[PDB]
Amino acid sequence: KLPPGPTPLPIIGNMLQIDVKDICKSFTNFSKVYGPVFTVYFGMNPIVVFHGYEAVKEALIDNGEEFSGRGNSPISQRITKGLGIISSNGKRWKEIRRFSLTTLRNFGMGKRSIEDRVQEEAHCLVEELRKTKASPCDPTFILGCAPCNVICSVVFQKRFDYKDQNFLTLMKRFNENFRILNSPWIQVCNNFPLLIDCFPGTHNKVLKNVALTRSYIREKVKEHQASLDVNNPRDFIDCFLIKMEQEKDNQKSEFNIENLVGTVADLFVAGTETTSTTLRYGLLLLLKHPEVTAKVQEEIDHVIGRHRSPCMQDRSHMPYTDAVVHEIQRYSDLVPTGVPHAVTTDTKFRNYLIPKGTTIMALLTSVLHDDKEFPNPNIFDPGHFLDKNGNFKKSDYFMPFSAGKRICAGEGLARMELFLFLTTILQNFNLKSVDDLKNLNTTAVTKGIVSLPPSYQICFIPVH
Ligand code: HEM
Ligand SMILES: Cc1c(C)c2c(c(C)c1O)CC[C@](C)(COc1ccc(C[C@H]3SC(=O)NC3=O)cc1)O2
Ligand SMILES: CCCCCCCCCCCCCCCC(=O)O
């Protein structure tokens, strides 16, 4: 007995009842008719949707174990093969994530903290923006390089030089597989697999890129193997290799060259375009909101000064900027529908039974936009994370990284990259818009699984 829901048409479920261009709007509308929990069918597939804090929490958190399964999909399986962390489940998942989480702690991979890799990058970033000579530009590409390089310096050792050819194709490929796989069409194709045949070129293009990336990562892992100094790991690959060596006698062990290549790939996928997007969105919101960028730069000046690059320890003494980064994430609403889950076994939810394997969808956006927890949930306002005395006010409704057992495996890095990149930038540049601010649109183009900020141009004017 699944939760209530629209009546499905025998073969295509409720597909033609939901706008694939903005399926979140469709879901919100269904909740107005069926309530917090409801079932909809994408083709033959039943998807139970959780909408609102009470429901999302009850599911993701209170029943975390049952809801910690990754929502399967033909396209994910063909590419990842159940390998790595993003698309794995059960034991293999539990083990890889557990290892990943620890080797991604600030000092979980050697003498060089992750924070220091981010700072080196935040630095190279401003020196690039510096090169645009205050002229108007589309930050998209340049902003996307930073997050990509962070991941590079987290898994491969040192960062790449922005001009490095290897770095640029390794990036244009992820950016390519991203622009393709984030199309509403993939959602359709995932439920009606036959449709993939209607896209031979695109199909080949993806697998082609997945080939080149994987084989490249594999080249790197051999490099890391030849130079492996077990006493002091340089990066994610050294740590994983070290771990392999230990489980060596075990042929059950998930830690093998297979999961390694996948997990590194997963890291690029899971941490590049997301961060990049929130970054662009963030700069855009700061551009549109001059009064906010000002207090941030005032806080930066008052705590960090003009003779020292910001660091994570400062965030503790910068409640406003903290509220700003949280509001940026709360407004960006990067993944409105959250990433699909799947219950691990027959699961009881209130007066409903959800059969093992059923696909779950916890509407993060419904949390992030709770009109009671965040009055005027649709306006960008740091006050949403600020108390009467200007102190940061954490919220339970802050779920942009999801929640429960499967919450973003890189929340820390994500938040770190956002705080260091944004501050390091505002400390060195002022944001000027090409046109009149009123003409500046900040409404997201919520097509596909990841929302994107509208396109825009910006001038980075170095400060004096
Ligand atoms: C501002 C940027 C980012 C946001 C908003 C974000 C958020 C998310 C979300 C919503 C999920 C899905 C959670 C779920 O299963 O319900 C996720 C998963 C994941 N994220 Fe991120 N992410 C970002 C950056 C990062 C970064 C920088 C890394 C890299 C270390 C990363 C690594 C992962 C991984 C590995 C998973 C899969 C975890 C699993 O399946 O157990 N993320 N993230
Ligand atoms: C590069 C990139 C991709 C391709 C991306 C997403 C992000 C955030 C990315 O940075 C979000 C999900 C989605 C838009 C669609 O769902 C998928 C998520 C991950 C994957 C992993 C595949 S894509 C790739 O180049 N290598 C992989 O292992 C496939 C599909 O894919
Ligand atoms: C194993 C990988 C399989 C990948 C299959 C991808 C199938 C969906 C391809 C969708 C392509 C959409 C192209 C048009 C995009 C647009 O113009 O908006």
Cα gap 261→213, rounded to integer Å: 10
The answer to whether 225 and 257 have CB atoms below 8 angstroms apart is no
Tell me the best of 260, 274, 281 to mutate to test the pocket of ligand 1, counting ligand atoms within 8 Å of each CB and taking the most.
274
Structural domain tally of the chain? 1
Cα gap 15→96, rounded to integer Å: 35
The answer to whether 232 and 215 have CB atoms below 8 angstroms apart is no
From residue 60, alpha-carbon distances to 82, 165, 242, 332, 336 in Å are 22, 42, 33, 21, 15
Cα gap 413→319, rounded to integer Å: 19
Handedness of CA 263, 267, 273, 277 (dihedral sign): positive
Cα gap 303→186, rounded to integer Å: 46
The answer to whether 139 and 179 have CB atoms below 8 angstroms apart is no
458 exposure class (CB count in 10 Å sphere: 0-12, 13-18, 19+)? buried
- Residue ranges at the known binding site for heme: 408
The answer to whether 175 and 167 have CB atoms below 8 angstroms apart is no
* Bridge partners, residue 352, by sequence: 349
Token pair of 131 as six digits: 């090169």
SS3 string, 12-77, reads CECHHHCCCCCHHHHHHHHHHHHCCEEEEEECCEEEEEEECHHHHHHHHHHCCCCCCEECCCHHHH
Going from the Cα of 133 to the center of ligand 2, the distance in angstroms, rounded, reads 34
Strands 37-42 and 352-354: unpaired
Going from the Cα of 213 to the center of ligand 3, the distance in angstroms, rounded, reads 19
Strands 359-363 and 45-51: parallel
Distance from first CA to last CA of the chain, Å, rounded?
66
Ligand 3 touching residue 141 (CB < 6 A): no
Ligand 2 touching residue 180 (CB < 6 A): no
* Bridge partners, residue 452, by sequence: 445
With vertex at residue 151, the alpha carbon angle to CA 410 and CA 167, rounded to the nearest 5 degrees, is 155
From residue 229, alpha-carbon distances to 109, 205, 270, 291 in Å are 12, 38, 28, 50
Residue with tokens 């949930």: 377
| HSE (side-chain half, CA atoms, 13 Å) at 195 | 14
Handedness of CA 129, 133, 134, 139 (dihedral sign): negative
> Which backbone phi and psi does 284 adopt, to 5 degrees?
-60, -45
Segments forming the whole domain that contains residue 282: 1-464
Method: X-ray
Q: What 3-state DSSP class applies to 207?
A: helix
CATH of the domain at 56: 1.10.630.10
Token pair of 106 as six digits: 């600030």
Ligand 3 touching residue 75 (CB < 6 A): yes
- Which residues does a 6 A CB cutoff place in the pocket of ligand 1? 70, 85-86, 97, 104, 266-267, 270-271, 274-275, 278, 334-335, 338-339, 400-402, 406-410, 413-414
